[PDB]
Symmetry: D2
Subunit: 120 residues, 4 copies
């Protein structure tokens, strides 16, 4: 299922546990950006997905502060887990930096990450 | 300034505690479409007038309903006399692969401390 | 009344547009933000026969941020709908992609939302 | 290197012309290419891109109305062209439907498309 170690297409490492209560907890390590070492993540997932072949909806957040760096920013990933022979988590993400009001129009980056259990 | 009750432009209510460790926890009640929410925020933001970056997730399942979907809000808290949490959001539904191209809605919500 | 006219967004940008009978949007865009100066060409499309059930009119347009004065090596697309009424409005979300190397492509695209009115706020 | 026919990951086709002035014009259609599936597209691209290895920024719009059907919606693609033997147009898109105000919160889908010169 969702619990395990995942890697995105750029080599980031997503170590997650899906708890009985719909909780996602774990750590995220980024290969890009103002990042170093592991960061805390928390999120939620549908603990009772449909039984018609649909994926499992989920999302999580990382605030880019730890004991070694603070980028004053946070990313959220929204997506779905798709089980099968090669399990996959397909996501789109929003990355918001803290800004002044005058710069808020350019505060948010958008992209897409796909995660598998094998390094790219 | 984050802990407390917040209201968006469409009648939803966002009840949150900002923990000392960077955790966001609380409940969300929606007027469109109570649920658990969790997320994270920058616990040491800049002190130069910049906002505080944050994000959170709600999976739309509780003891009464299940929409097989989840929303993430990404944004910043801005303090002052008219404090705001300004966000953009992504809402992904569980779909088949053939319907995955239309699985994700995008929008924006502004939250205030007064209805 | 209609899409054709001069519009302003919440940040002071000026959107001068003509909606042709064939579904074409043409005109100029002037930005109050970013690496921008003077007017830029825009082109886009809109639904020339919208639903009659109270729904808005879908549309979209693109500006590449190159003119005779500057070139930011970037382009914005706005996707949204025109809502008629006593205070006509075009509500949009936008994507702004800059030309980047492959190593920087992950951070090439900004996202936001602009609301346009025929009265300057 | 933009002018020509491009194919996305899900069986859609477009034939675009990139004009000297920055114009994108053409037709967006399905894999089969029957008339009911063809729509006008228009957009813009950076006609003087950087020469440091960066991609070429561009965008375009299709409103989903033709002489045969009307979905009351429009998609914009925003992205960059990357040349070479394995040329690509890498995009993210927004698809907005005309809605009432009460339904406007759910009017916009988001996704991503990658286009190649080979099916
Ligand atoms: C402005 O960006 C930053 O301040 C920053 C700092 C550290 C890491 C990241 C990062 C990693 C990552 C990823 O793996 N997938 C999607 C987004 C994303 O963003 C961003
Ligand atoms: C398939 O189910 C849904 O799409 C669904 C179900 C229940 C609630 C929501 C909901 C509430 C809400 C909000 O307040 N702000 C931004 C997004 C958003 O989405 C969505
Ligand atoms: C990275 O950004 C740029 O290179 C750049 C250059 C010139 C103008 C803009 C600009 C103006 C504008 C607007 O009015 N609404 C939404 C987006 C937006 O973007 C962006
Ligand atoms: C179903 O209702 C719609 O709004 C509609 C109708 C027809 C075609 C499309 C279409 C094709 C296409 C594509 O190739 N890439 C990204 C988006 C996208 O959207 C959407």
């Amino acid at each position: 299922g969702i619990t395990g170690t995942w890697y995105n297409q750029l080599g980031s490492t997503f170590i997650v546990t899906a708890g009985a209560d719909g909780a996602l907890t774990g750590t995220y390590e980024s290969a890009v950006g103002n990042a170093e070492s592991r960061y805390v993540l928390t999120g939620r997932y549908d603990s009772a997905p449909a039984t018609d072949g649909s994926g499992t909806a989920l999302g999580w957040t990382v605030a880019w502060k730890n004991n070694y760096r603070n980028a004053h920013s946070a990313t959220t990933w929204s997506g779905q887990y798709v089980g099968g022979a090669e399990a996959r988590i397909n996501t789109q993400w929003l990355l918001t930096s803290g800004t002044t009001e005058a710069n808020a129009w350019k505060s948010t980056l958008v992209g897409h990450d796909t995660f598998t259990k094998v390094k790219p």
